[PDB]
Design a protein around this nucleic acid. Structure first.
Lengths: 104, 91, 102, 50, 70
RNA sequence: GGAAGACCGAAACAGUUCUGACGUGCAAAUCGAUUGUCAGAAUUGAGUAUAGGGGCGAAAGACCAAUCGAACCAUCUAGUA
RNA sequence: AUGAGAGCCUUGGAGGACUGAAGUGGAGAAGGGUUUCGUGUGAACAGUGGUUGAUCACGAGUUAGUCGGUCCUAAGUUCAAGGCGAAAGCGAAAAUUUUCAAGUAAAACAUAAUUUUGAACGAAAGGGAAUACGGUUCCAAUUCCGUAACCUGUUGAGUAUCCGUUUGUUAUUAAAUAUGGGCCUCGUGCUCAUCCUGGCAACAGGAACGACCAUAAAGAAGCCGUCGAGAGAUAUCGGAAGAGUUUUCUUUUCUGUUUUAUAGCCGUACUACCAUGGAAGUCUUUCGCAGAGAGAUAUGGUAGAUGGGCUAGAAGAGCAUGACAUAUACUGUUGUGUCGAUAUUUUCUCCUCGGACCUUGAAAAUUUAUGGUGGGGACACGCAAACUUCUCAACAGGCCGUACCAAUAUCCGCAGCUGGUCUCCAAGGUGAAGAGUCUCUAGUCGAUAGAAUAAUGUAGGUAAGGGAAGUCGGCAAAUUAGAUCCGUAACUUCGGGAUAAGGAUUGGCUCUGAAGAUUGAGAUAGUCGCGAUUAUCAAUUAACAAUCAAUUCAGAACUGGCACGGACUUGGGGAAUCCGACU
RNA sequence: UUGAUCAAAGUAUCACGAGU
């Protein structure tokens, strides 16, 4: 049916302090368990697509994760996409070279 | 078939507000939130956000323009007016 | 434990079976509309993707040419396909009209 | 209830420990004027609020 | 019991430390579970041949408390 | 294909006609039949502003703690006839 | 039964009916403040009694690092002394107030460009260190024990890191993260030096250089409808186990089958990337439109797995279903936990895109990575070391709030008063459905009583004729009501009016016709010994050949109060006027 | 033409040294 489910923490109203689910027990009793907010990832910033390679998290619990889980080997690793940076390196590279020949 | 007979996209707002006020939003919402050839992205992917603030959905160029069409005929005239005049001051 | 009183579902497995020979739904019980008894946006959902599920087998078994979907997709984006029956003769005819022509 | 505070937990003992009746011998003083109490609280014929 | 370990030498290597005050074993009809309560963790070897108990039970640190239920 | 201050309807609310049920009640305004909206000018729990000749009012002089053409509480107040 | 004495309440035995999962049910908020519990009871108290009570008498009863106040800040209190007022104090975007800088390991010779309001309160509904599971008492449990993790801070131990060579080892090798180099008699000599290695890439790995300055995100969302998966709630099918009924019949209607956090490994739904490749006879793709020489289909890969699934958790864990045996006792012991499927927004969840919009959908505490000049590590015959973002051990974590009602008997309604009260879970059937009628699951009989068929009233009705005459007036009240099939008038701003009106049709029972999914089926020649073993693909094949499948249709025979949506859900209609446009 | 730059180099003469 089941013999229904209360809340057990104090707050009652269906709010974003507690999204919540129902799992079972070893008794068949199903107390009303709640989970956290949802974990997700940082961005590229320029291209603004939720990036690739980086674990879901919050910034709350984030510092107790190891370095590989945080980012990747290249510069601006979880700060930029590789779509971003390939546009971002060469852009001045001709222009600074153009700044050579324009300085003559 | 020819589904309505005149009104087109204001047909949601029917039997209301008057005759030549049902028509005046037709002539100003058959342009708005239709798709436009982007001057930069080349494709046809132009919808609105609010008044005068269009963005693409592809290649992420966003351009400020007219408020019921992509850019008014008032606007490019100015973009043509400052164009011919700019070569006159320093030259 | 005060051993419980039976709440028997016995009559229920004679209504959800006599529907399997339709003993109860003529006109006299259809109190809802036929529309939201079985809605269009799920009725048209079932037929349209099922023909796609025949299509992707027929896309890449070998049996229909690659260019013979992007004129047969518009028809499947159109209307004129009631069953999966009528699709196959309008292949077997039209795969024959491409055959003998070559 | 259930989210009180550390005045209203200590205030509520004083408006609880004052809810006995008379001391059960002290009507044998001299000049006994005390029959049963002045401040005597029920809780639906008397409110608290202070 | 948040970890399992299938190797046998490290199952004895992790035995002798400051933790691992006790060892809980259990004889299933299926297999045998090796529960060794450590301080933070707990380690588990699964063994199911019903004969490699004695050679790998002793094989023990001698002062270890054995929790024997069968 | 599911958009609109679109429709009939339920807990949410409102309060129309019966001028029906008690009118020393169930009540210093409610019960029972009936009726309207019901995906927005919607409905609402908490926090905070606004002050007595003023606050606030999708405007009736409504509402401001059962009081509202000026409250509410002590005085000059045994105020005058 | 008990009680001096019982229609109650006070029980416990039956067993009748209600509350119907948008309850009279289980637990949460505000407010209550000892009501919750046992024990004991005489009188007022319970608009009747009273043996029990929300009354007294008398005793106990609320345990935390993880639930939460606590920090952050929101509209806003105007709350440093620039100012004004006779003073109190100011229906005040106090932005002017030597330095009104927080400061910053800092350098002489106002440490350097830097910081504008200095301060604080303000949310047990927003932001936010981290946990749950089984049992347990006279009443307490994410708190107590049993057992099983984590966080924050502190401390400690190990932990890339010893080279060519040659100590081990003839050398090939090996401690040595990978030594070379010219020289030299080889080099022994000399010189050269490690602040990690992988992939074409996306990125990967157990750890491997922040002290500051710097960007860049997260922290950070509104609301609508959505295909994909999953969770649990249920429902049918089958093994099990034990209960249900028996005149009669029923391979039958029942309970019950479970596995939490935190972990490791497999690890696809699914969009977006990478390599290739160069598509028009355009092509791919969804419920849609979305997509493409700014690289589409492909071929493989990358990463997110929230998701699952086995194994850790799992003492036949514990639990539960029952076994047996023990006066029996905190006992004993036996057995079970096995599979498929089918669907739903009678609910939540990650993910996917689109939608209205002069409606663009909060801040900040705390936090990551990157950038950055300096600076500090930093020998190769090694000793290592590492706020090391690694493994792992000791070590504490204070403060208070917790019992109960949570409203037809603990609130406010002067009261135990049909009255207004914030949200949470939410079942069987019929059915459009969270309707409305009905039962299981939980719980209630609590509304003064046994009696008695007068009016009038109070509400629920039918009444032969005619049918508005009645009365201010068609107002109470009656017909209509669901769905399918047509059939739709004038006026229209051409979106209506539209359910117009005006109609037919509608059980039960017995059947055929249709709407899908997985293996397609699979010749042919021989082998071993029909068993076993080895292969191309047209026709097939339209509900092929095996197999399982939802449920809504589309008809037809035959039959019954001649009543058919049988109660419930639920519309009377039509020309005109005059308003006001409308919601 | 959606990167980006801060934190003295250069120079000069003195310190023109200390240690050595």
């Amino acid at each position: 049916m089941v013999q229904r489910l209360t809340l057990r923490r104090r707050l009652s109203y269906n709010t974003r302090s507690n999204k919540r689910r129902i799992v079972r027990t070893p008794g068949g009793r199903l107390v009303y368990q709640y989970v956290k907010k949802n974990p997700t990832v940082p961005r590229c910033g320029q291209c603004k697509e939720k990036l690739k390679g980086i674990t879901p998290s919050r910034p709350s619990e984030r510092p107790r994760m190891s370095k590989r889980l945080k980012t990747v080997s290249r510069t601006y690793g979880g700060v930029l996409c590789h779509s971003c940076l390939r546009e971002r390196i060469v852009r001045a590279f001709l222009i600074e070279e153009q700044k050579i020949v324009k300085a003559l | 078939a020819k589904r309505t007979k005149k009104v087109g996209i204001v047909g949601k707002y029917g039997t209301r507000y008057g005759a030549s006020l049902r028509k005046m939003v037709k002539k100003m919402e058959i342009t708005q939130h239709s798709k436009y050839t982007c001057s930069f992205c080349g494709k046809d992917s132009m919808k609105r956000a609010v008044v005068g603030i269009w963005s693409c959905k592809r290649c992420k160029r966003t351009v400020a323009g007219g408020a019921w069409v992509y850019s008014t005929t008032a606007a490019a005239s100015v973009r043509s007016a400052v164009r011919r005049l700019r070569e006159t001051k320093e030259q | 434990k005060k051993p419980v009183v039976v709440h028997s579902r016995y009559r229920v497995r004679k209504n959800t079976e006599a529907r399997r020979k339709g003993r109860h739904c003529g006109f006299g019980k259809r109190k809802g509309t036929a529309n939201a008894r079985m809605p269009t946006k799920l009725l048209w959902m079932q037929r349209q993707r099922v023909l796609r599920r025949l299509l992707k087998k027929y896309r890449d078994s070998k049996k229909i040419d690659r260019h013979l979907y992007h004129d047969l997709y518009m028809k499947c984006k159109g209307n004129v396909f009631k069953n999966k029956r009528v699709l196959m003769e309008y292949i077997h005819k039209k795969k024959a009209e491409k055959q003998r022509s070559k | 209830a259930a989210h009180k505070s550390f005045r209203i937990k200590q205030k509520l003992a004083k408006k609880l420990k004052q809810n006995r009746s008379v001391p059960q011998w002290v009507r044998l003083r001299t000049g006994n004027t005390i029959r049963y109490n002045a401040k005597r609280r029920h809780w639906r014929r008397t409110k608290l609020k202070l | 019991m948040p970890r399992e370990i299938k190797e046998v030498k490290d199952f004895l290597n992790k035995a002798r430390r400051s933790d691992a005050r006790a060892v809980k074993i259990k004889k299933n009809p299926t297999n045998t579970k090796f529960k060794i309560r450590c301080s933070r963790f707990l380690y588990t070897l699964v063994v199911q041949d019903k004969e490699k108990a004695d050679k790998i039970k002793q094989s023990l640190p001698p002062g270890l408390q054995v929790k024997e239920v069968k």
